[PDB]
Amino acid sequence: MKRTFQPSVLKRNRSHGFRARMATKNGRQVLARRRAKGRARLTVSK
Amino acid sequence: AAKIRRDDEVIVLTGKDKGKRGKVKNVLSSGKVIVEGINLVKKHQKPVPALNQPGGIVEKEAAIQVSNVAIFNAATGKADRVGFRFEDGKKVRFFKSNSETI
RNA sequence: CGAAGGUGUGCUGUGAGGCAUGCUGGAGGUAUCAGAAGUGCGAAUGCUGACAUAAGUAACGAUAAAGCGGGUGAAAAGCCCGCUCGCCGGAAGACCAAGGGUUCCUGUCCAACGUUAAUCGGGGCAGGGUGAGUCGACCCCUAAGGCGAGGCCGAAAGGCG
RNA sequence: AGGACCGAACCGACUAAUGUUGAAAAAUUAGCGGAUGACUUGUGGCUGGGGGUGAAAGGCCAAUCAAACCGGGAGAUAGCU
RNA sequence: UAAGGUGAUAUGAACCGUUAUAACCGGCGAUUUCCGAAUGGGGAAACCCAGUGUGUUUCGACACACUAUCAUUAACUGAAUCCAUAGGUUAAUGAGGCGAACCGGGGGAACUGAAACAUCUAAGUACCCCGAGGAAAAGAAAUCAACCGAGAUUCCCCCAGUAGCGGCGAGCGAACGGGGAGCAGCCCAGAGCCUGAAUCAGUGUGUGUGUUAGUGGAAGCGUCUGGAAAGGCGCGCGAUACAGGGUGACAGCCCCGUACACAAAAAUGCACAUGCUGUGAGCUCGAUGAGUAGGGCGGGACACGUGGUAUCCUGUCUGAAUAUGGGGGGACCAUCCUCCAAGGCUAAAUACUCCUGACUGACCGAUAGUGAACCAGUACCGUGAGGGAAAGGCGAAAAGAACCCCGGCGAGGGGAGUGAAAAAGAACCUGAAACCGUGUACGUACAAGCAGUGGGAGCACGCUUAGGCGUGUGACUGCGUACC
């Protein structure tokens, strides 16, 4: 049937994309916490 | 500093054959050397007729650890501590085992 | 020239234990006496790993159904070729897009994958392939909305206009 | 002309049946029905936690919700287990 | 410094060799695509599109070097509007982003305790924000005492579970001051005399010694066992060197090393001496801060709760005195002592880590210790913040699987080679419990409960020199409702 998440790299890159996160205090802090946990990707749209 | 070099005969202080001596053929970055007539290894090798076709086994040379290879004394059938000192370029033997200690 | 660990069989004490002797191992061990606890396992609707039974029992993804002859192969009813049949035919067809990402094609390979057979394959592994002035994007303007100077509000993150 | 009678595309929940360790995170088969509207829809936005949204059920708010989800104070507290 | 190197899986060709760029390293100093402060503007993780000025040419499009924002400095320009200035332009400096932990300021709980709750406790914690230095912060008095006097602050042991506060509850909890660590104080309100005299930093050098590239440094042989010894033995010898580590089973005498000892292109710490620049040793006499202290009203910080509540910040109104003046001394008053505001600054003894170095653990060892020793914050879950594994160790050495063959010119495998061994074949140390095949002996096709414990025929097995001992199996029968 239908899913609550449908595949879209346009809206993923708009909410969770690297520059989109960096352009906000809290998203830039999510990225700072990615670097604290050591996550190998900082974007999953590119 | 050097303690054996490749220009004169060496003897092996490891588990290897104690009745053989030879010169160094080649040196490795692993702290190892290849020596003439001491040791050989069988080496089967992949036949692969359209890419190799080696005619069976290779029977090749094998390296040994450089700390327990020593210079042959050519006098009493054994290894000796001799010292390496020279005024210009490559340091060669000064044979401290044939001189008095101070 | 066989020390610990693990472990069998016998011996021995009221008992936690202690002792002799075989198998395995090939590296480590330490007799005694004095100091010191990170010192006694089956349970916590406890945490993590392994395996039996349930049981060859369930299922193989609806209700279009491929057949025979020949081939290729060690092997084929499913692959290649021939003849023939069947169903869908507003789809079970044709073109465009999002989203995905080497999937295309020939050339081979058959361990694993497609909960099978597999010679097929979007699978393994190579090699080849993506030729634009005009096509879709870009151009130039800009809606909803976002950002936002000078300016304002706010410790501030942030926000108004 | 039409908050009009029937009706494709389009939409969609009411009855019945099948499904229910499924094909299945809600479908399937048949029918009745919504179809110029107080409608529906392609594409991109905007509305947030006692706040949103609601012709208003405390329903819906990414399966969760008399108060969502994650991370912290938190190994809080339990005359009990 | 040095002869073997050109990173590794990785070999070979080619290439430096060994001789004045071989590789490797120390100093400083270039080179540094695009994203990214990102600085023309736009924006999207590595992309997009302009302008200013100059030149070139089929004047079909090339391609330098430059253009941000804010604050300040200068120069030109300039609107209403003359002059001017907002505005515009050009050059320069400062900031911007990053980096572990510490640190000043701002926002500010609930839980918890009060065996119950609001004040009080908890807590200026938790978490978030701003900002900044090598430390941040504090300071030498309108302070603190008590007639004795102190004479900066911070950090430590104490003072003290005392004073004080306190639903006179629960409990919060000092100061004075001692012992100690650690000791730098000054200027402006203003001038001269003295002479550049004390002290500190910076900078050109010098000396002494470390740091960043180092190389020297004493002794062990034989014999046996073993495939191999760093072992046994004979004993021998060194030790200011018996520390790690490495090398084929235990290395004081094999290697990198240690004790012990040096050497210097450039860069640089500590300390001794010196030049220079800046600061200026000593003497003496003036002079003592008025929109802010008080005062009414209200908060904040005080150990300190609304009380009889001082003090210091601070909101608001209001605003002062001169020596028979003023602040304070925890109500208020006097007396008295002490300070005299209304100006500015301050040693590190203290705090801490990504990093640099020395030392250490009665630390763990693949479920340990971090979730993570392993191409792990990977695979994988969610729209997302955020959750989150499996998986190490053949061997001394790659010697790593030829050759002989069955098969599909297979998988899988025997023989065989290597090797100590692959009954070590990379799926590889040695491996108990769980699991499943292989073989032998017994009971074995008419009788019903925790399957054990006693008594026990037959059969089969092992010990014993055997003299009532075990093992396997077991007819039948006395006793018998488990365990947390």
UniProtKB/Swiss-Prot annotation, chain A:
NCBIfam families from the UniProt entry? rpmH_bact (TIGR01030)
Under InterPro entries, the record lists: Ribosomal_bL34, Ribosomal_bL34_CS
HAMAP family found in the cross-reference section: Ribosomal_bL34
The UniProt keywords, alphabetically, are: Ribonucleoprotein, Ribosomal protein
Q: Which residues form a coiled coil?
A: none
Q: Name the gene for this chain.
A: rpmH
Question: Can you state the subunit structure given in the record?
Answer: Part of the 50S ribosomal subunit.
A GO BP entry: cytoplasmic translation
What is this protein's name?
A: Large ribosomal subunit protein bL34
The UniProt similarity line reads: Belongs to the bacterial ribosomal protein bL34 family.
One GO cellular component assignment for this chain's record is: cytoplasm
Task: Mention one GO molecular function.
Answer: structural constituent of ribosome
Q: Which domain of life is it from?
A: Bacteria
Curated annotation (Swiss-Prot), chain B:
Q: Name one GO cellular component term.
A: cytoplasm
Give the record's GO biological process terms: cytoplasmic translation; ribosomal large subunit assembly; translation
Q: Which Pfam families match?
A: KOW, ribosomal_L24
Assigned keywords, A-Z? Ribonucleoprotein, Ribosomal protein, RNA-binding, rRNA-binding
Recorded hits in InterPro entries, A to Z, give: KOW (IPR005824), Rib_uL2_dom2 (IPR014722), Ribosomal_uL24 (IPR003256), Ribosomal_uL24_CS (IPR005825), Ribosomal_uL24_KOW (IPR041988), Translation_prot_SH3-like_sf (IPR008991)
Report the Gene3D superfamilies cross-referenced here.
2.30.30.30
GO molecular function (one): structural constituent of ribosome
Would the keyword RNA-binding turn up in this protein's UniProt record? yes
The similarity comment for this entry is:
Belongs to the universal ribosomal protein uL24 family.
Assembly with partners or alone: Part of the 50S ribosomal subunit. Might contact the SecYEG translocation complex when it is docked with the ribosome.
Q: What does this protein do?
A: One of two assembly initiator proteins, it binds directly to the 5'-end of the 23S rRNA, where it nucleates assembly of the 50S subunit. It is not thought to be involved in the functions of the mature 50S subunit in vitro. One of the proteins that surrounds the polypeptide exit tunnel on the outside of the subunit.
The protein's name in its UniProt record: Large ribosomal subunit protein uL24
Q: Which organism is it from?
A: Escherichia coli (strain K12)
